[PDB]
């Protein structure tokens, strides 16, 4: 699974915490803004946001998924860019 446990979407700019958990950069940043020093998954103490999960980003370049609203096959590294601009998404929101 390449999903983020915070936003439930495909990971975007993944970041890995000290406790080993991986979130979108903006998701772990916003988590820590709201509940400082705490992992949003396992509640472990976190002295910082973490480091870019470059291994996960590399693996996502070769994975694909169908769009939840237009069924088009999209590369996981580009999924956030797709849902930002997909008319079926824009239409619903």
């Amino acid at each position: 699974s390449f999903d983020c446990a915070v936003c439930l979407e495909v990971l975007h700019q993944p970041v890995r915490t000290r406790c080993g958990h991986v979130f979108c950069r903006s998701c772990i940043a916003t988590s820590l803004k709201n509940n400082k020093w705490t992992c949003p998954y396992c509640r472990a103490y976190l002295p910082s946001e973490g480091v870019p999960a470059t291994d996960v980003a590399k693996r996502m370049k070769s994975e694909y998924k169908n769009c939840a609203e237009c069924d088009t096959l999209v590369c996981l590294s580009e999924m956030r860019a797709h849902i930002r601009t997909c008319q079926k998404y824009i239409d619903k929101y």
Binding site: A5, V6, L8, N34, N35, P40, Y41, K92
Partner: protein, 147 residues
């Protein structure tokens, strides 16, 4: 942000519906949901159907939803206004939680009350000293209000 997360949860609920609860928005206010929970088997609530109201905050999932029973229920951690004393709805909320997980936790609370950190002390007292009396009363309220 919050709206897209709520929609995602609703879609995952429709794709794998749980065996013992249902939930969804009231009209097209996506931030106002209603849920049903079945009284758990081997509990005094067995056979009952309990209605809950859910209000999502606009910074969900970083703050918890507001969840309350609308069906009357006899339980040491739920009061006469339907308020629920449950740590994951307050200090132990985390952004990785979901409504699906909240509903499972509430079902577990019905199966296994927490009489040592109660919301209704008089009911916790009965639960701790006269468990069969608690069971009889809880069953009577289920028959009256949840069936």
């Amino acid at each position: 942000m919050a709206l897209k997360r709520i929609h995602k949860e609703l879609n995952d609920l429709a794709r794998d519906p749980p065996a013992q609860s249902r939930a969804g928005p009231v009209g097209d206010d996506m931030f106002h949901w209603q849920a049903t929970i079945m009284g758990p088997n081997d509990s005094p609530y067995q056979g009952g159907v309990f209605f809950l109201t859910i209000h999502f905050p606009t910074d969900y999932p970083f703050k918890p939803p507001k969840v309350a029973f609308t069906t009357r229920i006899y339980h040491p951690n739920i009061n006469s206004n339907g308020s629920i004393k449950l740590d994951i709805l307050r200090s132990q909320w985390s952004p990785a939680l979901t409504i699906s997980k909240v509903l499972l936790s509430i079902s577990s609370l019905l199966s296994d009350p927490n009489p040592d950190d109660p919301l209704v002390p008089e009911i916790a007292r009965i639960y701790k000293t006269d468990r069969e009396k608690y069971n009889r009363i809880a069953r009577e309220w289920t028959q009256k209000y949840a069936m």
